[PDB]
Amino acid sequence: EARMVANCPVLVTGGARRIGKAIVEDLASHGFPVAIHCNRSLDEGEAIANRINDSGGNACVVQADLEGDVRGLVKQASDRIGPIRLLVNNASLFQEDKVGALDMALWDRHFAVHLKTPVILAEDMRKALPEDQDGLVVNIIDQRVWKLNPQFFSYTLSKTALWNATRTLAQALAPRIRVNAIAPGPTLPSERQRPEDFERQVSKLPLQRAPELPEFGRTVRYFWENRSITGQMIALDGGQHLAWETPDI
Numbered sequence: 066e067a068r069m070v071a072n073c074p075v076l077v078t079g080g081a082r083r084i085g086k087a088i089v090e091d092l093a094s095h096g097f098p099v100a101i102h103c104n105r106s107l108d109e110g111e112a113i114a115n116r117i118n119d120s121g122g123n124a125c126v127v128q129a130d131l132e133g134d135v136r137g138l139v140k141q142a143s144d145r146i147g148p149i150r151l152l153v154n155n156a157s158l159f160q161e162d163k164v165g166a167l168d169m170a171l172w173d174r175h176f177a178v179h180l181k182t183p184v185i186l187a188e189d190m191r192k193a194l195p196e197d198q199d200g201l202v203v204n205i206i207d208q209r210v211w212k213l214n215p216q217f218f219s220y221t222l223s224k225t226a227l228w229n230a231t232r233t234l235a236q237a238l239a240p241r242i243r244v245n246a247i248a249p250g251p252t253l254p255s256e257r258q259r260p261e262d263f264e265r266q267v268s269k270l271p272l273q274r275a276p277e278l279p280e281f282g283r284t285v286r287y288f289w290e291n292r293s294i295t296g297q298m299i300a301l302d303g304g305q306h307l308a309w310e311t312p313d314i
């Protein structure tokens with residue numbers, strides 16, 4: 066076989082900032098060729114790619130709107146670094162809505178970025194990946210799919226759908242492509258979160274600590290390195306999904 070990292074081109078969606086960037090830089094530093102997909106963060110993406118290449122790694126930037134036609138995205142990437150073998154579906158939209166005031170326009174976007182696009186890209190990767198190569202899809206989801214609540218209604222349904230799809234994609238794409246997932250908990254402040262709000266939330270986690278950014282790339286590599294694993298998720302969440310103390314107790 067030939068599963069050495071130099072022969073495992075990676076596509077990370079929304080890879081130019083924050084968690085996506087941490088994954089990109091971890092994989093690139095371990096010798097994976099990496100395609101950094103981005104949209105609004107082109108400047109950042111190019112900077113990351115330049116640094117990797119100057120350090121002797123292998124990186125490129127691809128640009129696409131994951132709510133438009135994404136049927137060309139895998140090919141943009143493979144044209145640069147070779148057939149995509151490891152797909153990280155990291156890109157996301159995290160907007161609040163609730164029952165009683167649902168806007169089907171925002172609903173549609175959530176399902177576009179978290180469900181439609183990841184499935185389409187997994188489909189496209191499979192079609193283009195040579196038959197003598199095994200592949201891996203890692204979906205970046207959200208710990209809340211393991212502890213359902215009514216907040217962020219359409220967001221939550223779209224992320225939970227991605228977790229459901231992690232199972233059914235794993236079943237559909239086996240044996241050649243494995244599909245696993247990471248469910249982050251509080252990792253970086255969520256735009257609507259001030260630092261104090263983030264720190265307080267973390268202090269309330271069962272483990273009282275946030276996942277460290279290196280854990281994300283380590284987990285992608287863990288899935289890559291242990292070939293008996295498919296259809297499964299690790300919550301890098303400080304135990305958030307196991308929180309249990311509700312007012313009724």
Ligand SMILES: NC(=O)c1ccc[n+]([C@@H]2O[C@H](COP(=O)([O-])OP(=O)(O)OC[C@H]3O[C@@H](n4cnc5c(N)ncnc54)[C@H](OP(=O)(O)O)[C@@H]3O)[C@@H](O)[C@H]2O)c1
Nearest residue numbers: 079083084103104105106130131132155156157249252253
């Ligand atoms: N941060 C946390 O603590 C946390 C907690 C739970 C779950 N998660 C999940 O972990 C993953 C990473 O978190 P994050 O906070 O780092 O994500 P993010 O910053 O909110 O966004 C990541 C990327 O998604 C891309 N994106 C969104 N819509 C796009 C579109 N139509 N077309 C192309 N790109 C689009 C963007 O790329 P461009 O910027 O280039 O446009 C954006 O940079 C996400 O899936 C998130 O849902 C994170």
